[PDB]
C-alpha cells in the first residue's frame, strides 16, 4: 500500500506510504500530494489542459481508492505531455518555495515535539510567519556572486534554504550549535536536494553545519563573509559581546541583518564611546510597513563602515 507521484522532469518518483502520515493539527500528507499536483499544473500549462475537472475537485483524502486515482490521473497527464516533448532548470517562483519549505519540513521533522519551540516564530509555522519577512529581507539586500552568506545559528536551516533557492551567491552557509536541530539540518538538507531535484528548480550552493560560531575557527569565518543573518533576540550580553568583537574584524561593506540592533540607532561618536560597535558601523531599521498583512515586524541591516571612526580623528585634527 503507496501512492506514486512522478516527477515533472523525469526525476526518482515521490513514494508515499499508505495510511499517509499526519503532520500536525491542521496539515497532512494528502494535502501535500493534491497541493503538490496543483503547483505542477501552475507551472506546466501543457500538463493543466491533459487533465480531468472533477480529479482536483471531487476527492476523499480518506480514501485509499480515492487518492490513487488522483495521483493515476496526474501520472498519466505527465506521462502525455513526456509522450508531447518528445515529439519537440530555473529558481522556484515564491509561492512553489513556500510550498516546498513546507513539504521538506514535514518530510524531515516527524517529532513536532522534539524542537522545544514555544515561540511566536517556530520551523512549524516557518512559511506562515517567517518566509515572507526572509522574502523581504532578501529583496532588500540584492546579493551577488561576489557575496558569500552566513546564517548564525541556523537552527533546521531553512533561511539558509531559501536564501540558497533566491539568490546566487557564491556559497551559503547556516551555523547551528544544537544537537537536535543541527540533527534535524542533516534531513532537511537532503529533502531540499531531492525535491528540488523532483520539481527541477535550482538553487544556489549551500552548507548546513554543526558548530560553535563563537569558536576560534569561525573568527576568520566571519570576518570572511560578506552577509551575515543573525536572530540574536534571544542571545546574553556575554553571547552579543562575543559577537560584536567577531564583527569588528569584518571588511569594510561588510553586512549584518538581525533582528535587535548591535548598536543604536542614532549612534553619535564621542570622546567616551570609541569602544563601541557604532564607531565602526552604520544601522537602519528596516520594516516590511514602509502590501504588507502579516505581523508588524522590524528586521536592522548594519554595514561596516570605519569612516565613522576616521571622520571624527579627521575632525579633532582638522578642526
Ligand atoms: O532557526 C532558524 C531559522 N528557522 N528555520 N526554521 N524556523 C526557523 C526560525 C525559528 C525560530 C525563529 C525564527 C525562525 Cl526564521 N534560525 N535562523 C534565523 O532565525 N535567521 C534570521 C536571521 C536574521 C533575522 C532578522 C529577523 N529575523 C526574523 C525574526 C523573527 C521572525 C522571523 C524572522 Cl525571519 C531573522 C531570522
Ligand atoms: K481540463
Known amino acids: 500500500l503507496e501512492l506514486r507521484l512522478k516527477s515533472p522532469v523525469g526525476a526518482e518518483p515521490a513514494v508515499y506510504p499508505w495510511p499517509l502520515p499526519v503532520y500536525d493539527k491542521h496539515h497532512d500528507a494528502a494535502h501535500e500530494i493534491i497541493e503538490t499536483i496543483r503547483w505542477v499544473c501552475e507551472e506546466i500549462p501543457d500538463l493543466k489542459l ?6 482536483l475537485i471531487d476527492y476523499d483524502t480518506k480514501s485509499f481508492e480515492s487518492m490513487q486515482r488522483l495521483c493515476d490521473k496526474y501520472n498519466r497527464a505527465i506521462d502525455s505531455i513526456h509522450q508531447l516533448w518528445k515529439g519537440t532548470n530555473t529558481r522556484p517562483s515564491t509561492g512553489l518555495l513556500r510550498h516546498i519549505l513546507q513539504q521538506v519540513y514535514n518530510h524531515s521533522v516527524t517529532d513536532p515535539e522534539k524542537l522545544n519551540n514555544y515561540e511566536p516564530f517556530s520551523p512549524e509555522v516557518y512559511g506562515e510567519t517567517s518566509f515572507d519577512l526572509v522574502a523581504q529581507m532578501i529583496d532588500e539586500i540584492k546579493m551577488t556572486d561576489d557575496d558569500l552568506f552566513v546564517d548564525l545559528g541556523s537552527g533546521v536551516g531553512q533561511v539558509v534554504l531559501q536564501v540558497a533557492a533566491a539568490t546566487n551567491c557564491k556559497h551559503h552557509y547556516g551555523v547551528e550549535k544544537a544537537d537536535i536541530p543541527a540533527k534535524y539540518a542533516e534531513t532537511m538538507d537532503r529533502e531540499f536536494r531531492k525535491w ?6 535550482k538553487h544556489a550552493e549551500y552548507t548546513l553545519e554543526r558548530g560553535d560560531f563563537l569558536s576560534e575557527e569561525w573568527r ?13 533576540f534571544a542571545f546574553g550580553p ?9 564583527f569588528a574584524n569584518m571588511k569594510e561593506g561588510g553586512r549584518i541583518v538581525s533582528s535587535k540592533p548591535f548598536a543604536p540607532l542614532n549612534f553619535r561618536i564621542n570622546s567616551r564611546n570609541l569602544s563601541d560597535i557604532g ?12 502590501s504588507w498583512t502579516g505581523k508588524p515586524v522590524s528586521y536592522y541591516l548594519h554595514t561596516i563602515d570605519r569612516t565613522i571612526l576616521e571622520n571624527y580623528f579627521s575632525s579633532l585634527k582638522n578642526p
Open 50 to 55: 491533459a487533465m480531468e475537472n472533477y480529479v
Open 196 to 201: 528540488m531535484k523532483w520539481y527541477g528548480k
Open 220 to 232: 576568520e569565518r566571519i570576518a570572511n563573509t560578506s552577509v551575515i543573518f543573525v536572530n540574536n
Open 238 to 246: 556575554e553571547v552579543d559581546h562575543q559577537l560584536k568583537e567577531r
Open 279 to 290: 564607531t565602526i558601523m552604520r544601522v537602519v531599521e528596516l520594516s516590511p510597513l514602509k
